[PDB]
Design a protein around this ligand. Structure first.
Ligand SMILES: O=C1c2ccc(O)c(O)c2C(=O)N1Cc1ccc(F)c(Cl)c1
Ligand SMILES: O=C1c2ccc(O)c(O)c2C(=O)N1Cc1ccc(F)c(Cl)c1
Ligand SMILES: [Mg+2]
Ligand SMILES: [Mg+2]
Ligand SMILES: [Mg+2]
Ligand SMILES: [Mg+2]
Ligand SMILES: [Zn+2]
Ligand SMILES: [Zn+2]
Lengths: 184, 368, 368, 184
DNA sequence: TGCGAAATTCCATGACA
DNA sequence: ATTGTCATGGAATTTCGCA
DNA sequence: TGCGAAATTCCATGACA
DNA sequence: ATTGTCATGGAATTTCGCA
C-alpha cells in the first residue's frame, strides 16, 4: 500500500457559534491529513449552503480525494452529497457520537480551539480580522512527530514567516479572569 | 566673412576651398563654378541664418535641408553646419521619431522559490457581472500559480481585502506591481510594511516589466472568452473555474503545471499525474526541489542591427506619456545619471527630479 | 473497442500496438507497461470522449492536451486524435491567435502620371480651430503633391465641396480611398460618375492600403505639431503654410520635391532650384518626362520565416473588426474563392456574401 | 536673356459686378503668362481683403515672381503691397487707362469674358457652381500659336478631360433674345 | 547499422488595451 | 529606485520499432 | 594609383489613432 | 472587387582633392 500524500484526505468541521464578528458566527475548519495544513473559512451558519460556498473557494485551489467529517447535518444532506459527487470527491463519515480523525488531525484541531480561545479574550468580536494570522501561526508550527511544519510539507520550502516563538497557547491568570467575567 | 572671401578672389588658397575651381565676383556676391553649376558662397557670418531659413521651411532633417541650401549656395562642409542646427532645433528634437531600436530585452532569473516574488495586476473594466468590473490577478513568480479575485474597482482597498485572503496561505518576500494607483498609495505601502513584504515597482508606462502577470492575463481572458461563446458575458462565476483550469495546465516547454511546481503532486483533478505514487512525501519533495532548479530559462535575444544602449552622461529623451493631439511625443533632453542595467536607467527628469525609467521609453538625443 | 483489445490480450499483433511490450488485463481494463509507466489503453469507442475531456479542461492546444491524456492513457497515434479534436473545437478556432505571419507586402507601381490616381483620407478630430475639426487630405499618387482642406465633419458633403474646388485644376482618372462613411456613400459615387472618375476602395480595416496618403498625414501632423509648440493649437491658419511647406520639401531618396514632379520647375518659393534656367519650357518638360519615369521604386521585401500565402479553396478566418470585451477576435472559418494577388483575396463571408479582404485580416484555419 | 517659364508672371484682374450667385458678385481672374493657365476665384467685393484671401489660396499652391495688374484700387493699396512684399512677389502695373498684358493673355481674358457670358444667359445666378467647369474648359483649350493647351504646358502631360469640341463661344439668336430681355 | 514513421523539440508569432 | 512572457501549431530533429 | 576626408547612398526604425 | 510608405540620422560606401 502507497504512502500518505497531501490532498488524500481533508478533515472538515465547524467551530461555533462564536460572538458575531463582521457578521459571521462560525468557522469551517479544513485540515489536510498528510501535512496538517489548515484552512479556515468564516460562515454565517453551519449550513450545507455555507459549506458549499466555502469549499468552493478551497476546491478552486486544490481538490481532495476524500472529505472526512462527523455526521453534522450540513455534511450529510443530499445537496452536499451531490456537490461532492460532481467533483469526484468521496465522502467519509465517523459514526455518530464516536468522532475519530487521526492523531495528527486531533491534535491540530485541539491547537485550533485553544489558539482561537486565546485570541478571542479581550477582543471576542474581532476574530474575523485575525483568521489570516491564526492560519499562518498554525501552518508554521513545528510538528514534534514529523521534523517539519505543514507549510514545509505542503510546498517543500521554508516559509518567510517562521513562528520561532512556539508559544504558550495557555491562558494567563488575567485572561481566565477576563473569560470567567465575559461568560457572566 | 569678408577677410576669408577677400584672399580668395585674389587666387590665394584657403583651407576648405579646393584650389582647382575658380572663384569670381558678380552682383556684389562671391561665386564659384561647381560641377552642378554656379553657386553663391556666402560670408561665414551669414551661414547660420541661411541654414536656419532652409531648415525652417518644413523643419526638415539633414539631406532634405541640405538639398534646399545646395540649390543656391556652396561652402566648405555644409552638412556640419546643417547638423549643428538640427541639434539645436528644440521643435525637431522633441517631435521627431527615433530611428534607433532599444537594446535586446533581459530575461530576469526565475525566482528561486514559491512565494519569493508575486506579480500582481488588474484586468478590466469587464462587462458588469454581479456588480463586479475588475479582476485582481496574483501570479507567483516561480511557479506561475495564479489567484483570481473579482473586484468593483482597481482600488487599494480591494487589493488589501484580496491579499488578506491570499496571505492566509503564505506571505511573499516581494510583491512586484506596475505603478497603478492601487499599488502606489501610501495605504498599500503600510499594508506591506506591516507584513515584512518588500514592494517592487515597474518602471512607469512599461507593462512588459510585469510580463509574468500580463502574460497570464492573456490566458485568463482567452479561456473566459472561449467559455462564454454564445452566452451572455457572465464571468463572475467562472473565475474559480478558470483559476483551477489554468493552475493545472501544462506549459509545453516546462512539462509541468503551476500546481505541480507549487505542490510537487496533483490534487484530485482530472487526469492527475501518478508517477510519484510509490514515493514517500519526503522523496517527492526532494524530486520537486530538483525539478524546480533545473527549469528551462530563456536567454537575452540578439540585438537588432541598429539598437542603442545607454551610457552615463548621454542626452536622452523620455517619451511623453499621454500626449495631447498635435503635441510632441518627446520631453526635452535629459542626462543619464546611472545605468542600472542595460535596459534601465536613472535620468535627471525635466521637472527636474531623479526618475527611473525603461530604455523603451527613451530615445537618444540626435546630433549629440 | 473490444474486438481489437481482445486479440491483443492473447498475444496476437495489431497494427499500431508495438509487439515488444506486454499488454495485461487489470481492474476490468486493458493495460500496458510503457517506459514512462503503466497506462490504460481505452477502447477506441472511448477515445474521442477522453481527448475531448482533456482538451476541455482549459481548451489547451496539442502538447498541453496530450500531456494531460498521457498521465492516464496510452494508445496508437494519440496526437492524431488530439489534432482531430482541435480542428473541430469551434471555440478554439475562433478565439486563438494565429502563429503564421502574412506574406511579404506588395509595392504597387507608382502611378505613371500626375492625376492618374488620387489617394484621399481624413485626419481628425483635432482640437477645434475656427469651428473646424477635420482635414481632408488629397495626395496625388505620382508626385506626392498634396492638397489640404479643413472641414467640420468627415462627411460626403464636405468631401464633395473640397473636391469641386480641387478638380477645378484637373480631373483624376482614379480616386482611391478607404471605406470611411464619407467615401462609400451613394452620393459620393454619383459625384464621381458624373465626372468620369473611377472610385477604388481599400480592403476593409487596412489603412496600409491607403499608405500613400496615410504616410503624408504623418508629415502633416508632424509639421503642425512643431509649428504649434508652446502656442495654443490654432491649426486652421497653418494648413496653407503646411501644404506649401510639404509640397516643396525634398524626398531624400528621390531628390525631387512633389512640386517639382508636378510642374518640372520651382515657383517663387525660398531656395528655388535654377538648373533649367537656360532650357526652353519644352526642353524642361522633356527632362521632366525623363525624370518621372526613372524614379526609384522599392521591391517586395523577403518573406518572414513563417508566413503563409492564400490558396484557392483554403479555410481562412477573417479578423473580427471591433470585438466586444471577452468575445472572439476571429469569425468562423470561410473559403478562399479567389486569390486576387498574393496579399488580397475574395472569400465566402460568414454572412455569407463575397468579401474582398486583405490577407493581414485573415488567419489560415488551423489543423486543416 | 532666359526663356519664359510658368510662375514668371501672373496676370490678375476682376470681372464684375455679376448677378449675385450663392452670395458672390465678382471673379478674380489669374492667368499664368507663359502657359495661359487660368485660375478663377469668386469674391464678394473687389477689395484688397478679398484679393488677399483669394490669392492666399493660389499662393499656397504656387508663388509667382511677378504679379501684373491694372491700377485697380485693390491692387494699388499699401496692404496689397505689404502682402506681396512679405512673399517676395514683385508688383507690376500697367499705366492708367492703358491696359497692356500680352497677346496670349489678352486673348485668354477675352475667351474668359465670352465663355462667362455664354453660360450666364438662361442661368445668370448659377455661375458659382460652374466656375470649376469653366476653368477646365479654358485650361484644356488648344493654343493656335503654341502647339499645346495650358494644362499640357503646366504639367507636361495630356489631360483626362480633353475638350475636343473646341466650341462656338458665340451666342445663338435665341440667347441674344434672352440677353437683350434680361437687360430690360 | 539503417530505415520509415512517430514522438519530441524547436521557435516565430502575437497578445497581455 | 530595476529587468518581458509563454501558449500555439507547423517544421526540424530525434527517437522508436523493427530488422 | 593611392590616400584621408567629404559627400553620397544605404537602410532599419517607426508612425500614418 | 485589389496592392503600404517614406522622413530620418548613423553607418557603409563612393567620390573628391590632391599627389
Ligand atoms: O497597456 C497596458 C497597460 C497600461 C496600464 C496598466 O496598469 C496595465 O496593467 C496595462 C496593460 O496590461 N497593458 C497592456 C499591455 C500592452 C503591451 C504589453 F507589452 C503588455 Cl505586456 C501589456
Ligand atoms: O487606424 C487607422 C484608421 C482607421 C480608419 C480610418 O478611416 C483611417 O484613416 C485610419 C488611419 O489612418 N489609421 C491609422 C493607421 C494605423 C496603422 C497603419 F499602418 C496606418 Cl497606415 C494607419
Ligand atoms: Mg496594470
Ligand atoms: Mg497589465
Ligand atoms: Mg480614413
Ligand atoms: Mg488614415
Ligand atoms: Zn526643426
Ligand atoms: Zn477548445
Amino acid at each position: 500500500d502507497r504512502p500518505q500524500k497531501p490532498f488524500d484526505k481533508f478533515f472538515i468541521d465547524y467551530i461555533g457559534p462564536l460572538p458575531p464578528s463582521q457578521g459571521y458566527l462560525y468557522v469551517l475548519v479544513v485540515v489536510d491529513g498528510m501535512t496538517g495544513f489548515t484552512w479556515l473559512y468564516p460562515t454565517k451558519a453551519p449550513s450545507t449552503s455555507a459549506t458549499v460556498k466555502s469549499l468552493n473557494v478551497l476546491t478552486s485551489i486544490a481538490i481532495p480525494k476524500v472529505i472526512h467529517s462527523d455526521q453534522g447535518a450540513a455534511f450529510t444532506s443530499s445537496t452536499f452529497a451531490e456537490w461532492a459527487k460532481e467533483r469526484g470527491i468521496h465522502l467519509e463519515f465517523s459514526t455518530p457520537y464516536h468522532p475519530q480523525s487521526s492523531g495528527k488531525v486531533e491534535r491540530k484541531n485541539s491547537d485550533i480551539k485553544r489558539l482561537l480561545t486565546k485570541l478571542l479574550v479581550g477582543r471576542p468580536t474581532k476574530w474575523y480580522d485575525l483568521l489570516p494570522v491564526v492560519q499562518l501561526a498554525l501552518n508554521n508550527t513545528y510538528s514534534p512527530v514529523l521534523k517539519y511544519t505543514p507549510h514545509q510539507l505542503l510546498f517543500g520550502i521554508d516559509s518567510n514567516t517562521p513562528f520561532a516563538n512556539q508559544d504558550t497557547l495557555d491562558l494567563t491568570r488575567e485572561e481566565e479572569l477576563s473569560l470567567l467575567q465575559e461568560i457572566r | 566673412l569678408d577677410a576669408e572671401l577677400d584672399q580668395l578672389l585674389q587666387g590665394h588658397y584657403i583651407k576648405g576651398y579646393p584650389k582647382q575651381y575658380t572663384y569670381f565676383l558678380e552682383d556684389g556676391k562671391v561665386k564659384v563654378s561647381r560641377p552642378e553649376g554656379v553657386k553663391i558662397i556666402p560670408p561665414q557670418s551669414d551661414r547660420q541664418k541661411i541654414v536656419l531659413q532652409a531648415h525652417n521651411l518644413a523643419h526638415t532633417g539633414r539631406e532634405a535641408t541640405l538639398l534646399k541650401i545646395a540649390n543656391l549656395y556652396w561652402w566648405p562642409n555644409m552638412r556640419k553646419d546643417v547638423v549643428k542646427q538640427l541639434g539645436r532645433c528644440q521643435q525637431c528634437l522633441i517631435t521627431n521619431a527615433s530611428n534607433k531600436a532599444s537594446g535586446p530585452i533581459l530575461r530576469p532569473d526565475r525566482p528561486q522559490k514559491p512565494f519569493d516574488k508575486f506579480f500582481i495586476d488588474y484586468i478590466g473594466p469587464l462587462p458588469p457581472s454581479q456588480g463586479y468590473l475588475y479582476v485582481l490577478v496574483v501570479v507567483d513568480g516561480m511557479t506561475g500559480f495564479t489567484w483570481l479575485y473579482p473586484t468593483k474597482a482597481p482600488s487599494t482597498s480591494a487589493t488589501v481585502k484580496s491579499l488578506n485572503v491570499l496571505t492566509s496561505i503564505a506571505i511573499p518576500k516581494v510583491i512586484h506591481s506596475d505603478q497603478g494607483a492601487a499599488f502606489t498609495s501610501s495605504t498599500f505601502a503600510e499594508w506591506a510594511k506591516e507584513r515584512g513584504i518588500h514592494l517592487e515597482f515597474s518602471t512607469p508606462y512599461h507593462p512588459q516589466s510585469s510580463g509574468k502577470v500580463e502574460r497570464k492575463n492573456s490566458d485568463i481572458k482567452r479561456l473566459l472568452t472561449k467559455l462564454l461563446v454564445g452566452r451572455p458575458t457572465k464571468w463572475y462565476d467562472l473565475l474559480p473555474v478558470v483559476q483551477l483550469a489554468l493552475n493545472n495546465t501544462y506549459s509545453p516547454v516546462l512539462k509541468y503545471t503551476p500546481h505541480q511546481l507549487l505542490f510537487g503532486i496533483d490534487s484530485n483533478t482530472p487526469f492527475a499525474n501518478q508517477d510519484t505514487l510509490d514515493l514517500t512525501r519526503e522523496e517527492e519533495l526532494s524530486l520537486l526541489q530538483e525539478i524546480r532548479t533545473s527549469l528551462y530559462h530563456p536567454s537575452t535575444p540578439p540585438a537588432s542591427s541598429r539598437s542603442w544602449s545607454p551610457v552615463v552622461g548621454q542626452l536622452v529623451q523620455e517619451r511623453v506619456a499621454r500626449p495631447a493631439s498635435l503635441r510632441p511625443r518627446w520631453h526635452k533632453p535629459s542626462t543619464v545619471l546611472k545605468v542600472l542595467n542595460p535596459r534601465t536607467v536613472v535620468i535627471l527628469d525635466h521637472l527636474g527630479n531623479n526618475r527611473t525609467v525603461s530604455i523603451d521609453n527613451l530615445k537618444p538625443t540626435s546630433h549629440q
